[PDB]
Amino acid sequence: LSSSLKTCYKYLNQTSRSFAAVIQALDGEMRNAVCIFYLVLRALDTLEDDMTISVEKKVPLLHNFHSFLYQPDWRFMESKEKDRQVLEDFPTISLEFRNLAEKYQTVIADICRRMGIGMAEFLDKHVTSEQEWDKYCHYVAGLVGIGLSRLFSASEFEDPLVGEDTERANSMGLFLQKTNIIRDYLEDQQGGREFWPQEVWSRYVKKLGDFALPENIDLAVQCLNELITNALHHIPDVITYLSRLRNQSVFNFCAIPQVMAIATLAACYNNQQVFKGAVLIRLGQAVTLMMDATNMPAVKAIIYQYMEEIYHRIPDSNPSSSKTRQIISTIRTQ
Amino acid sequence: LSSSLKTCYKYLNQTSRSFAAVIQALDGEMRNAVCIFYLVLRALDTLEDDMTISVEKKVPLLHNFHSFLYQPDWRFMESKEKDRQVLEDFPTISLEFRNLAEKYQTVIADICRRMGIGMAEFLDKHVTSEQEWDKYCHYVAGLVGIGLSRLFSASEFEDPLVGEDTERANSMGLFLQKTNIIRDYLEDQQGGREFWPQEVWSRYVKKLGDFALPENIDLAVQCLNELITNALHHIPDVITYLSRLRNQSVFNFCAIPQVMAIATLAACYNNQQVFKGAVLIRLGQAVTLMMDATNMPAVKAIIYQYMEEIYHRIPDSNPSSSKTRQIISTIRTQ
Amino acid sequence: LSSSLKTCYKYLNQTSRSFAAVIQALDGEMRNAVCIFYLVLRALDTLEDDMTISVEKKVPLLHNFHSFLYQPDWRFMESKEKDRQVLEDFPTISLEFRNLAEKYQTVIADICRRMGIGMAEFLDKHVTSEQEWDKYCHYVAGLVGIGLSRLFSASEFEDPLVGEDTERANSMGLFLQKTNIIRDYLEDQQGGREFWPQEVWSRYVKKLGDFALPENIDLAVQCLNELITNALHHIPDVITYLSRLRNQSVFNFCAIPQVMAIATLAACYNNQQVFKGAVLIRLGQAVTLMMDATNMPAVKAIIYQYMEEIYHRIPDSNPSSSKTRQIISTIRTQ
Amino acid sequence: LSSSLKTCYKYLNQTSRSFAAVIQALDGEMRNAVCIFYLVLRALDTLEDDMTISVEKKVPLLHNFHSFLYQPDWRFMESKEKDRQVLEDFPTISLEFRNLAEKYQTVIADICRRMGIGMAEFLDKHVTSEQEWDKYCHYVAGLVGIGLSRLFSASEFEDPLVGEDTERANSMGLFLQKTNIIRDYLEDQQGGREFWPQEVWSRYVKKLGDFALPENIDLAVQCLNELITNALHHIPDVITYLSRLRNQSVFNFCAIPQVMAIATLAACYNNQQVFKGAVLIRLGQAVTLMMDATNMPAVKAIIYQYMEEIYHRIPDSNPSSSKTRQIISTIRTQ
Amino acid sequence: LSSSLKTCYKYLNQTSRSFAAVIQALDGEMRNAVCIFYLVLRALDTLEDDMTISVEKKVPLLHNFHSFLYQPDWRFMESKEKDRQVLEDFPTISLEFRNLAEKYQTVIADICRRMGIGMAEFLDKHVTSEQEWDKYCHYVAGLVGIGLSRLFSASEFEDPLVGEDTERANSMGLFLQKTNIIRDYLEDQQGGREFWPQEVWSRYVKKLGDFALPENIDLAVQCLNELITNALHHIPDVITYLSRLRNQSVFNFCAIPQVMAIATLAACYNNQQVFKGAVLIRLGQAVTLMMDATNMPAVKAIIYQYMEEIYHRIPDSNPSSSKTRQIISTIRTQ
Amino acid sequence: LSSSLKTCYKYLNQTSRSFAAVIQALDGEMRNAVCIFYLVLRALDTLEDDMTISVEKKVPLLHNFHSFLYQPDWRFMESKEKDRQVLEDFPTISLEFRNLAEKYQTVIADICRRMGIGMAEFLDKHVTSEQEWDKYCHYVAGLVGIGLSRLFSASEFEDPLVGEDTERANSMGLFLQKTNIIRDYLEDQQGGREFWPQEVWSRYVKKLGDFALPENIDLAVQCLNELITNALHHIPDVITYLSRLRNQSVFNFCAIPQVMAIATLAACYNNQQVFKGAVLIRLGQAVTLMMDATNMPAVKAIIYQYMEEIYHRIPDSNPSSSKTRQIISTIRTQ
Ligand SMILES: CCCCCCCCCCCCCCC[n+]1ccn(CC(O)(P(=O)([O-])O)P(=O)(O)O)c1
């Protein structure tokens, strides 16, 4: 087989410590299509995150990235990010992208283009409102869920409905993105970047960096809970999306990340550790550990289990305690 | 939508730890039917267990419980139990109960009726013979297995045979109940509760309480092993029962508790720790770690594995050693 | 139940503390067929391992073992091996063997016939080339995989294509055997048994036993990694074989031993402990704990994770470093 | 959808009156893969059949045809055959060939390379021995059967065995080819083409053209039956091949041609009309009409029906009568 | 077996010449559900077609038809159609309707209600724009498709996804309706009813009746081909819808009507006989004879076969030729 | 491989123009078991029908036929029948019979034993009542269906139920036999054979032979219709039997003859030709021309359409018209 495709899977394993295995487990055509999708996305993300690239220089690269997929010799050699290897050897990745069936190239290129537009659009401004937060998450993750969904339908491995329902697919992305943003608060603060919606933290402190100051630990945990509360609103759509899947390999690929995300929100809920160091995922409830995330009823059980971990811990004092219980209740009676 | 249905699910998660998540993961009509069935059973249980309610008041409550389901305003405000909330706000629960398709009401009402009669019967006595132990377990657990089964069949998510074969359904309940009774010897002794068959424990000591005395530990373990051998006899029926389920959400619901009970019996066998406190369930073998309880073949293997954990520990000096091997031998060959 | 059949399952559990459970979970006729097949193989294996039986007396026993299946009174009372009970009470075993439907009998007799010839051939000599290693594994393990596959097809539980593809069925056996031979180095040394191919370890030390001397540890690990690299080559065939299976009970039976063999290889890689005693099997990330080994996509994911575990610990200086990377690369990509 | 792909399918329907339909019905990837494979083979046949091409310009074209697939601009404008359009717009066809997954490209390219050899090799010489007749058919039909089988397996829609067993794939081709060659006796003669094996007809006349001559009819029908008996030998392999198929779209694609071919050999057997004109595709018995060629058992029954239809019309007179009855006996008892 | 159900099946066979057989072949509960669903639709249609009915008296009948199903004594004796029996004995029909499971009644009732509205809405209105043609069709045929899909899922013989996909379920109906409307020109003409979209025929003649006039055959044909081209646009959804089906009985039920519709569009395309009467169904050949319409690949082969017959007969003259090739090309390629 | 087994299939194709094809298409062990079964029955039938054999001598031959299977040298040289060949070379067939598994031999021997008894019993009488018509058919046909059904269940390709439900299996044979007896009236009459039940035909004419005389043509047809109506009664059981089969090869073997019988009755209904010559099957129809007889839903549809073809031709004045409409109505509603 192609040695360039082997190089691609090497990059996938280098850049995805967690999902390389389940991506490689996808049946037939989706395997390479998703591996390449992941890689071009990692290249785009590396370009977005690289702070040694001024905004004026970066915008045209984000805007035209989707077209670089068709420039056999294009590569980027000035990146200082950890995964700069995918940009420097981008010709190897784009070569394999161009070997994918055209119907997949069309989907992936379309996604990359729109993602570029949104990313550029967000280089000179922080996230203000929650509506803006959803817009940003849509661009960096929602679109990925939409892209992947359109590939599942185009491959016929899933029902045509999966790719058409862009809202449910967008939700899969928004749930994971918000979860990572919430969990990575401290890391992003030392990195010099702010993603938490300004309209939300500006009501607890005046500098998002303030949640790093112990004298505001309580105020932080309250804002933390408000965002987690905001994230939980996507679960109904996550369940609906997962319930339409019928291909086992695709189901594992989609379900596992969502379960991990919910497990993360659970561990972070009302946890002061989010503002000190890493939050190690609390592990196992007798029943959750009895099943895995490979069949829909089990995934539901696991999700509901984690729901309870949050509910049974909602403090009365918490300013969001009522909104938290409400959404968890709405999810339970779905 | 219903504020009452959301309230029922709130109580479910509040009062249920081992079934809340799996109950919510059930398909269609079974979801609400089992949720409410669990709440009405939880209410009856709370009454049955409240020792501040005199026998004079308790007998009529148990006997008539089933009709309270149809008395819109019925409720009980004198319970001193932890879950008393389901009794005080029973109208909400019964409201949702009368809301179920008539066929489910038939099942739930019939079970509460027979359950109330049986419980009322044991308020003044302890379990003597092994025949009375089955009888007692049948009233508090077997009937529940039979009710759930009849509900699965009524919903049509499972074949009629499931609800029809009451003996197998009964064994499902007896196996869980006998396992809990055996495991909680000490926790119950400290609570003034006795459930071990007197006809059995009397052959070792003059009082059931003596098994808590360090000098009778050897006799306690012989009694312990004998009771466990007794429980093992239900396994063939448990396997026959689970092997007939076609619906995944139902399978998950029924299999998990059974496997957990089996692991408990295995962890308790010939273990002095049963009489010193709460016995820890040592993990499984490499093969059990490789599979979960979500498909029948996997459950059989898990069950057969825990059976060998017991077989491997049977000491020739134990007075039940021979009977313990026989039932396990029989289970292996079927 | 048959007392003789009850006895076979007693022996099955006595000699197979790990596979007995999955064998007993096989659907219908495969259950007894595989049980008996395992016991006759265990008997044949015990004859081969017994060093108190001279070569001239062992050769006839191995060559004619297949016909004894049809001699009701045949047994062997001189073995001193741990599982000698299957030989001393073989009449009970061959009895249940003659009870199986003829289509299973034919496959089992054929495999024992061919296996006996192969075992006899290696009684005198030691494994020289890697090609001979393959031949020896083919005889003691590959034929078993082939026999089993034919038993799955005959029963109609698996498609006839499973039984027809002898190449991959053979690979299934070679992978398990090579893993066991690799892991059991020390144990085989302290037993006067040599299974590592000579044309391989001779390039590292003068006597295979030298690997047991701490001053050769570095050399022992290099040879270890070379053999492990060799075994990894069977994985593609293992994945292809497992992917063709349709019956759940058969899939569980076939996939679990493979995953465990892979976990083992992952643990032993570049591990000095292999040459000092036993190796403690660790365990990986959530993807591993979020899914079990009962569906193909999940088995693939588990295998890919263990592959990365080895890939990540590959030392540049290792003489097989490149080959290890390329075989793992092939598995990842294709 | 690419304009070039639409054009490819437009050509498919132009050049394939009786098949574009079942090719367009193939699942997923096999669709375009077989469409293009058919088109390129069409272009190669157009060159091999175009007598307005000097043998020295042709031989190199047939030999290097396989490499033009990678040359974007290659084309041929001097063809005057009816399907001159595929050569004239080959760039469009080669473009889509290069968009196929690499694993399909290598299969198609390899087959054209080898096919180009055999064709050039038989550009000047007619078929002499029967051995040569198989060689000839292998080069123009067998390899196509082998090529398709490798595509079927590489797509994973069919088992790995379908692609590996080249002899069986080869036979599917030989059978169709010999059948058409037999049926097309006259047309070939009224066109200067001689495909019937010389070493066989030379025993009936002096010039293969003498079969059209009315007085030699008896010897003609005698020769015709001998060839038909020769073709019948491929049936066992054809049944074996079809028996391994599991994908319905592939099964329809493979089965129809073989059944139509077998039906043809039955209509031409001991039929004088073969030397007077084209023969009609005679129906059959009430069956067939009541069984489609959509499931292997049905196809088997249909084949036997036609076998018997032939067997019956076997005159003791004919010199091949012995061999004909023999092969049909083998086919029916197998 | 009730005599009212027997009577319904008598009516079924009376009013449905070529579909009673396939309806009777439907598995389990779908059998009676569709038989009954077909009869209520016959009734409601008999009313909409009856002209001796006051438009102002007809409207209310259409609007309340859905409720008549629940009025035991309801019936209509003033109708003067051929299928008036289903109206005069509606109580026998509604009676059986009320015997259907609740879940099926809900669907059939709901569809009849929405259908009733649309039918009324078009009484004093002709078909103008093509979008209106789709609205009318959606009301008389489209909703029928949606109802059936819902019944399939409700019965659980088809995946819930079948019911959800209302758009493709609707296209199924539109395809059949446009086909009959196009084919039944003359008859409807000599009946006083106009269904062909005004915006379409107007661009050819002043009065839709003109096409009946011999001197306009040409203009008539062109308008014909343009409408046919309109209907062809539904094949992609048809193919997609049928591909999702998993139950054999349901497949036959949905596929057959679709195939015949296409076999009609082919027969009629560019054929003057359409205006001079009712054209015949006159075959296909070869690859067809080898396949019924009981498996997706065969239905695709059949569909593409007819698509070809239309494509070949496309007059270079026709003002829609281009659009005709464009859609047939998209159907071929995609 | 066997020269004798070769000869057996040779005879199977000379003595079975209606079952050879589908028998030879049976899976695995059923193939030879059935071929052999059909050959012994063939021989047994050749004895019973031979009139050159005195009754005095024929009785012993029919009673001990089941025993001749175990007499390697048994044969009959004095047969004058057309298929005498199977009796003269019976050892060749008895030889193969003895090569079959025992369970298959048990079935063929038993049926051959019970079949010899009934045939002998009818050597002296003609069929009187309709009850005696079922009895005669039971011995010569019903038992063949029962035998075959048991063979299917012993080979395990079908569940035990197929062989257990002797009633349904008997109805299969009765439908075919009655159909054949009805169709072969004339042929039989000219051969001096009479199978029509006297209690039925004596109500029309004085002697069964009178239906051969042209003046009795109308009376003959009415009797014909009454007999056809009788036979139709077995169709519900035919459908039940066919629908519970799961092996495709068995399904085809069972469905095809039945559908053939149904088509024949439909062709013979109210047809005067029955009494002048042989009737030709006018099968097919636009809708069924889209189906074959290889899947249950299709077989049901095909059967139903044939029922309608009959229902449509029922003469009002026909004395059995009521009964005919009744059975057909029942078949429609079941
Ligand atoms: C599961 C359904 C089983 C249905 C079994 C129906 C059995 C009907 C009675 C058959 C007994 C075996 C007769 C073998 C010899 N025989 C008797 C009559 N025939 C006539 C024929 O040779 P054949 O119909 O091929 O079997 P024909 O081609 O002239 O129709 C042949």
| DSSP secondary structure, D45-77, as one string | HHHHH-TTS-HHHHHHHHHHHHHHTT-TT----
The three-state (H, E, C) secondary structure of chain E, written as one string: CCHHHHHHHHHHHHHCCCCHHHHHHCCCCHHHHHHHHHHHHHHHHHHHHCCCCCHHHHHHHHHHHHHHCCCCCCCCCCCCCCCCHHHHCHHHHHHHHCCCCHHHHHHHHHHHHHHHHHHHHCCCCCCCCHHHHHHHHHHHHHHHHHHHHHHHHHCCCCCHHHHHCHHHHHHHHHHHHHHHHHHCHHHHHCCCCCCCCHHHHCCCCCCHHHHHCHHHHHHHHHHHHHHHHHHHCCHHHHHHHHHHCCCHHHHHHHHHHHHHHHHHHHHHCCCHHHCCCCCCCCCCCCCCCCCCCCCHHHHHHHHHHHHHHHHHCCCCCCCCHHHHHHHHHHHHHC
Method of determination? X-ray
Helical spans, DSSP H, in C157-247: 160-164, 166-183, 185-189, 198-201, 217-232, 235-244
- Beta-carbon count within 10 A of C85 CB: 17
Chain D residue numbers touching F288 (CB-CB < 8 A): none
Interchain CB distance below 8 Å, F25 and D301: yes
- Return the structure tokens found at F14: 């000379």
Q: Helices D30-49 and D55-68 meet at what angle, rounded to 10? A: 170
∠ CA E157-E163-E167, nearest 5°, is 145
On whether the CB atoms of residues C40 and C115 are closer than 8 A, the answer is: no
In angstroms, the CA E141 to CA B241 distance is 47
Convert C189-203 to b/e letters by CB count within 10 Å (16 or more is b): beeeebbbbbebbee
Give the gyration radius of chain D's Cα atoms: 20
Nearest CA to A287 among B309, B255, D120? B255
By CB atoms closer than 10 A (0-12, 13-18, 19+), residue D312 is exposed
In angstroms, the CA D297 to CA D294 distance is 9
| Cα-to-chain-centroid distance, residue D238 | 13
Query: How far is residue D6 from each of residues A106, E139, E317, measured CA to CA in Å?
Result: 17, 35, 22
Give the gyration radius of chain E's Cα atoms: 20
| Cα-to-chain-centroid distance, residue F82 | 19
Q: Look-up: residue for tokens 């699965």?
A: B152
On whether the CB atoms of residues C266 and C313 are closer than 8 A, the answer is: no
Q: Which of F290, F292, F299, F303 to mutate to test the interface with E (most CBs of E within 10 A)?
A: F290
In angstroms, the CA E296 to CA D22 distance is 11
By CB atoms closer than 10 A (0-12, 13-18, 19+), residue C80 is exposed
**Contacts with F36 (C-beta within 8 Å, 6 or more apart), sequence order:** F8, F93, F96, F97, F100, F108
Chain E residue numbers touching D293 (CB-CB < 8 A): 290-291
Is the domain D1-334 a CATH 1.10.600.10 member? yes
- Ramachandran category for residue F2: left, alpha or beta (phi over 0 → left; psi -120 to 50 → alpha): beta
In angstroms, the CA C40 to CA C116 distance is 12
In angstroms, the CA F243 to CA F154 distance is 19
How far is the centre of ligand 1, averaged over its atoms, from the C-alpha of F11 (Å)?
13
On whether the CB atoms of residues F323 and F229 are closer than 8 A, the answer is: yes
Give the gyration radius of chain F's Cα atoms: 20
On whether the CB atoms of residues A292 and A22 are closer than 8 A, the answer is: no
In angstroms, the CA E255 to CA E247 distance is 12
H or E element that contains B286: helix B286-289
Catalytic residue from among D253, D275, D306, D311: D253
∠ CA B189-B195-B197, nearest 5°, is 120
In angstroms, the CA D250 to CA D248 distance is 5
In angstroms, the CA D218 to CA D267 distance is 17
Query: How far is residue B81 from each of residues B43, B44, B139, measured CA to CA in Å?
Result: 10, 12, 21
Chain D residue numbers touching E330 (CB-CB < 8 A): 1, 6
- Return the structure tokens found at B92: 């909400």
By CB atoms closer than 10 A (0-12, 13-18, 19+), residue E219 is middle
On whether the CB atoms of residues A115 and A45 are closer than 8 A, the answer is: no
In angstroms, the CA C155 to CA C150 distance is 9
In angstroms, the CA C13 to CA D223 distance is 69
How far is the centre of ligand 1, averaged over its atoms, from the C-alpha of F312 (Å)?
30
Among F14, F15, F50, F174, residue to substitute to test ligand 1 (most atoms within 8 Å of Cβ): F15
In angstroms, the CA D229 to CA D197 distance is 13
The DSSP output letter for C84 is T
The three-state (H, E, C) secondary structure of chain F, written as one string: CCHHHHHHHHHHHHCCCCCHHHHCCCCCHHHHHHHHHHHHHHHHHHHHHCCCCCHHHHHHHHHCHHHHCCCCCCCCCCCCCCCCHHHHCHHHHHHHHCCCCHHHHHHHHHHHHHHHHHHHHCCCCCCCCHHHHHHHHHHHHHHHHHHHHHHHHHHCCCCHHHHHCHHHHHHHHHHHHHHHHHHCHHHHHCCCCCCCCHHHHCCCCCCHHHHHCHHHHHHHHHHHHHHHHHHHCCHHHHHHHHHCCCCHHHHHHHHHHHHHHHHHHHHHCCCHHHHCCCCCCCCCCCCHHHCCCCCHHHHHHHHHHHHHHHHHHCCCCCCCHHHHHHHHHHHHHC
Catalytic residue from among F31, F84, F193, F325: F193
- Beta-carbon count within 10 A of D103 CB: 17
Catalytic residue from among C253, C269, C275, C306: C253
Please tell me which of the candidates B13, B260, B294 has its beta carbon nearest to residue A295.
B294
Interchain CB distance below 8 Å, E252 and F297: yes
In angstroms, the CA D220 to CA D242 distance is 33
Helical spans, DSSP H, in D89-197: 90-97, 102-121, 130-137, 143-154, 160-164, 166-183, 185-189
Nearest ligand 1 atom to the CA of F15 is 22
The DSSP output letter for D279 is P
**Contacts with B84 (C-beta within 8 Å, 6 or more apart), sequence order:** B46
Nearest CA to D331 among D292, D305, D293? D305
On whether the CB atoms of residues B208 and B199 are closer than 8 A, the answer is: no
On whether the CB atoms of residues D266 and D302 are closer than 8 A, the answer is: no
Nearest CA to C28 among C144, C149, C160, C152? C152
**Contacts with D29 (C-beta within 8 Å, 6 or more apart), sequence order:** A28, A29, A101, D101, D104, D155
Q: Helices B296-312 and B321-333 meet at what angle, rounded to 10? A: 160
In angstroms, the CA B137 to CA B117 distance is 13
**Helix and strand totals (H; E) in chain D:** 18, 0
On whether the CB atoms of residues E275 and E214 are closer than 8 A, the answer is: no
Which of the other chains make 3 or more beta carbon contacts under 8 angstroms with chain B?
A, C
The residue of chain E with its CA nearest to that of A102 is E334
How far is the centre of ligand 1, averaged over its atoms, from the C-alpha of F19 (Å)?
7
Q: Look-up: residue for tokens 């042709």?
A: D58
In angstroms, the CA D270 to CA B329 distance is 70
Q: Is the Cβ of C308 closer than 8 Å to some Cβ of chain A? A: yes
Could you tell me the maximum CA-CA distance found in chain E, to the nearest angstrom? 60
Helical spans, DSSP H, in chain A: 3-15, 20-24, 28-49, 55-68, 85-88, 90-97, 102-121, 130-137, 143-154, 160-164, 166-183, 185-191, 198-201, 217-231, 235-243, 248-268, 296-311, 321-332
Question: Whose CA is closest to atom 29 on ligand 1?
Answer: F17
Question: Whose CA is closest to atom 7 on ligand 1?
Answer: F141
Half-sphere exposure of B131 (CA within 13 A, CB side): 0
The residue of chain E with its CA nearest to that of D290 is E292
Query: How far is residue B289 from each of residues B293, C197, C289, D174, measured CA to CA in Å?
Result: 11, 33, 9, 54
Convert E158-168 to b/e letters by CB count within 10 Å (16 or more is b): bbebbbbbeeb
- Kindly list the protein residues whose Cβ atom lies closer than 6 A to any atom of ligand 1: F 15-19, 38, 41-42, 45, 141, 144-145, 148-149, 172-173, 176-177, 254
**Contacts with B114 (C-beta within 8 Å, 6 or more apart), sequence order:** B139, B143
By CB atoms closer than 10 A (0-12, 13-18, 19+), residue E94 is buried
- Return the structure tokens found at A221: 């945990």
In angstroms, the CA E165 to CA E169 distance is 6
C253 labelled catalytic = yes
